[PDB]
A paper describes a structure:
The physiological role of the [name] [name] is quinone reductase, and this is likely to be the case for enzymes of this class also in other bacteria. Reductions mediated by [name] involve electron transfer from NADH to the various substrates via ping-pong bi-bi (double displacement) reaction resulting in the transfer of electrons from NADH to the enzyme bound flavin co-factor, which subsequently passes them on to the enzyme substrate. We discovered the soluble [name] class of enzymes in search for such a mechanism. This class of enzymes is widely distributed in bacteria, and can greatly mitigate redox cycling not only by a one-step reduction of chromate to Cr(III) but also by preempting its reduction by cellular one-electron reducers. Structurally, [name] belongs to the FMN reductase family of flavodoxin superfamily.
In order to gain mechanistic insights into this important enzyme, which could afford rational means for its improvement, we report here the crystal structure of the [name] [name] enzyme at 2.2 Å resolution. FMN, representing the enzyme active site, is located in a shallow cavity surrounded by loops 1, 3 and 4 at the C-terminus of the β-sheet. FMN is anchored by several hydrogen bonds to a typical strand-loop-helix nucleotide-binding motif GSLRKGSFN (residues 12 to 20) located on loop 1 of the protein. The asymmetric unit is composed of two molecules forming a homo-dimer with a buried surface of 4670 Å2 (about 32%) for a total surface area of 14630 Å2. In the dimer, the two FMN prosthetic groups locate at opposite sides of the interface with loop 2 from one monomer covering the prosthetic group of the other monomer. A potential metal binding site is observed in the dimer interface, involving residues Asn50 and Asp52 (loop 2) from one monomer and the carbonyl oxygen of Leu14 (loop 3) of the other. A calcium ion has been modeled at this site because the crystallization buffer contains calcium. However, size-exclusion chromatography at various protein concentrations, including those used for measuring the enzyme activity, showed that the active enzyme is indeed a tetramer. Within the tetramer, the dimers interact by a pair of two hydrogen bond networks, each involving Tyr128 and Glu146 of one dimer and Arg125 and Tyr85 of the other with the latter extending to one of the redox FMN cofactors, as shown in Fig. 3. We also show that a hydrogen bond network involving four amino acids at the dimer-dimer interface and reaching towards the flavin mononucleotide (FMN) cofactor plays a central role in chromate reductase activity of [name].
Residue numbers in the entry:
A (entry chain B), D (entry chain B): 4 to 185
B (entry chain A), C (entry chain A): 4 to 184
The structure:
């Protein structure tokens, strides 16, 4: 069984991308198991001085060890001002500074959702440029951009229910599972 | 006289970009007064729940008001992992949610420095894409990419000394001053 | 009254973006006259040897002069392979080499359409990066990405009909008109 | 012996990138053979109407068949206005429309050179975004950006002679050769 984890790019309780991430474990192919990674909320802003005098934040090393243990990582994130959320980017800046950089050679799947029609596509291309330097193995197609995400979820359960969205989500995961087999 | 402020993208005290930023005051045109904005170090990670429950952070409000009063903003920052540093971007995310969005229509000048020959060039274009949604007035030329800034600064004073760099910057500021109108 | 011209990025006769372009004349503000520039179809591939030996192509010179006379340029184009179409970009490469570079300081408005929901959004930001080196004055908002334009046009007239799209465009032009100053 | 070919992004006789491309065959690892692809100069501007009424240009199909035959492709190109040269992009637009798109799943190496200090880096990131849609297998590091390329070549021979540039060029090719073994 492949072990895939999710890195969440939004910090709000009712996050839509948060709902997409929690739905993935329930629709993953039988040969895949998905779990959520710890939240990035308590990670402090990156400062070279702290890295030297304090060492690495426990939260950063905990997140890093779980990524190394996993066979694949799915980054589920919204788009902020046509790009990557500062919080998520900051968690990536810390990670990129670690011994045995956790994402190098690591299979990565990208997922974004927005209330807008474009569904976070802009965020995705900047993210790939970032992951290139970190040497992650990013899967090309299929891509997933959840537009008008609010009309495809269930507020109570906090999950995706729109049939169309569920099939594409399941399709991509399957492709990612086959991708990981490398 | 024009009032210009600097937004710093690095937090370490030995910051080379910080050196660039603190050098701008004495090489700017005689019609410009360059001062620094507060550090983005205390600005907490963006969370809509916080915006709703607590309102906007006081540090964010302070940063914003200084931006509103300025005639222009010079963003001085390094490039982290082929893009914009997490901290700087997070501060921008916060500012972008403000009712009277501070950077809307605000003239902006970009400058980056790095220990490598590319001088933070990649970071600049991602930052330009981001600035479109904030609706800022970003100047085109001349651009400034400080390649290997470590060889052209003076540690004792923490300012730039390489005459070539100094004239480049001065030319850019002079150009930014004309841009304001 | 302002003179605005359109640079078309697609060459096929059934071009949806072409439909957008030819619709702009009757939805523009009363202070703007929108006309089309010549097609980029005859512009040959850029080659410095040709620039040196033959000089600039007459078609390139013609395109340039019309750009110089206009108060603004609206670039209407599709998105090919997640970026700017080869032909359009090649025409820009030619213009960029001209002594009195036509687009320098020229206000530019970008609009794209596609048969998909993204509406050529990716192409727009690459094009914005390119326009920095040409030193153009590119407007920020509102932006226009015509998603699935095929469902909102009228083949018999070859113009846009979807009222929502029409008002969006009109609003953009009105905004571009104010931008010129 | 792996068969690698070069796609040239500049059309001028004295092209510096042209010199870099011609030097590659002479410094490739013993397990690799490099050849130049036909020139893109005579390829007409892409027009959907021509594709339908005329079919594909012979030059486009000749270039496409040679790419399919090769084990790897090195794109050597300059940077025009912070991006990909229109001519090269146009040759890619035609290619992307072919049956059995020639670059899908094809190993690709990127090389750029400029008279400027940045050496065509801007062109490279836009190109990768393009190759992602075409589903090419693009190698991450090492990257090659030849800055101030004019002071590293020999006008007469039309080749690179700067020792430093030659070593990196040889290093990348070796990495690409090992990369191709996939
Ligand atoms: C700082 C900030 C910037 C935003 N900018 C964008 C943007 O550039 N593109 C976009 O599609 N949506 C943007 N939005 C709207 C988000 O898509 C929307 O708030 C979304 O539902 C947030 O993701 P979440 O629900 O998982 O918290 C922005 C939201 C925030 C908080
Ligand atoms: C998290 C992190 C990521 C880095 N990644 C890059 C990069 O992608 N490109 C680059 O040119 N330099 C990179 N560097 C090197 C910086 O350019 C160099 O540390 C610089 O001197 C930092 O800016 P400062 O001196 O103002 O603190 C990185 C540094 C850090 C801390
Ligand atoms: C070479 C080529 C590449 C294409 N690639 C893309 C793409 O990357 N993104 C997209 O949204 N549409 C793409 N399409 C579909 C176009 O959006 C669609 O054909 C469009 O209607 C063309 O613009 P036009 O109608 O003005 O000729 C491509 C079309 C062609 C001819
Ligand atoms: C249309 C055009 C646009 C140019 N724009 C850029 C640019 O954006 N970045 C850059 O580094 N060099 C630029 N240059 C300078 C080239 O790097 C230089 O002419 C180079 O030596 C061309 O590649 P080649 O020698 O193989 O023909 C431009 C050249 C041309 C012909
Ligand atoms: Ca929260
Ligand atoms: Ca030639």
């Amino acid at each position: 069984k492949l072990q895939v984890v999710t890195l969440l790019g939004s910090l709000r309780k009712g996050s839509f991308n948060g709902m997409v991430a929690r739905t993935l474990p329930k629709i993953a192919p039988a040969s895949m198991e998905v779990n959520a990674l710890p939240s990035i909320a308590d990670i402090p802003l990156y400062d070279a001085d702290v890295q030297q005098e304090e060492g690495f934040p426990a939260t950063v090393e905990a997140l890093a060890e779980q990524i190394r243990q996993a066979d694949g990582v799915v980054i589920v994130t919204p788009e902020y001002n046509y790009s990557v959320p500062g919080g998520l980017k900051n968690a990536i800046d810390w990670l990129s500074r670690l011994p045995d950089q956790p994402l190098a050679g690591k299979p990565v799947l990208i997922q974004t959702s927005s209330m807008g029609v474009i569904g976070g596509a802009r965020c995705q291309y900047h993210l790939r440029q970032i992951l290139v330097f970190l040497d992650a193995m990013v899967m090309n197609k299929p891509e997933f951009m959840g537009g008008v995400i609010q009309n495809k979820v269930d507020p109570q359960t906090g999950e995706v229910i729109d049939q169309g969205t569920l099939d594409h989500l399941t399709g991509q995961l399957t492709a990612f599972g086959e991708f990981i087999q490398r």
